[PDB]
């Protein structure tokens, strides 16, 4: 969740950077992860633990 966007790229087998351009996933970005529905559930569980 501090690097999860990289984790999802590893899962998708995609490079995050390339010559002169960058690849991003909007929803899975840190703040967007926090704002996501399931992201809130994960955040709550982590805070509880």
């Amino acid at each position: 969740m501090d690097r999860f966007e990289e984790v999802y790229f590893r899962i998708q087998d995609l490079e995050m950077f390339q010559p002169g351009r960058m690849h991003r996933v909007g929803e899975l970005s840190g703040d967007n992860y926090l704002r996501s529905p399931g992201g809130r559930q994960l955040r709550a569980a982590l805070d509880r633990f």
Binding site: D13, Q18, P19
Partner: protein
């Protein structure tokens, strides 16, 4: 004909300004190919950073060490985690004590270099202040 160059830098260097600008300068002005840890994360994952680092170190025709951020563009330096700089420095020290392939290593800086022992050790390699030494650095690569 093509030529390939490896780039090293600590995490302190801002990627968005300094590294992007330097990569584009290398690709266009210097007429060379750039190898970066950012671009080959899949290969790093397969090999592991140490093996990948050594592979690039032996494979690369030239190696560039960047010790300070750019000044041509104003940045806060942010755009806290383990990086390859200490390992790259150890491998460079191995090569230096071997006193072989010393030509490959080149030191590049824009802002004044910090007062650190590792940088002094790297200072043994040729220096190029790209604020003024763009053409000389390009010739060195070519």
């Amino acid at each position: 004909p093509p030529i390939k160059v490896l780039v090293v830098y600590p995490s302190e260097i801002c990627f968005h300004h300094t590294i992007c600008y330097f990569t584009e300068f290398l690709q266009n002005h210097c007429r060379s190919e750039v190898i970066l840890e950012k671009w080959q994360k899949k290969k790093i994952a397969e090999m592991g950073p140490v093996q990948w680092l050594a592979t690039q170190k032996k494979a690369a025709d030239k190696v560039v060490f960047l010790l300070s951020n750019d000044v041509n563009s104003v940045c806060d330096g942010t755009c806290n985690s383990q990086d390859l700089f200490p390992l790259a420095f150890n491998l460079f020290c191995s090569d230096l004590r071997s006193q072989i392939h010393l030509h490959k290593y080149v030191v590049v800086y824009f802002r004044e270099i910090d007062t650190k022992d590792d940088y002094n050790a790297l200072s043994v390699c040729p220096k190029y202040h790209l604020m003024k030494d763009a053409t000389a650095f390009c010739a060195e690569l070519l």
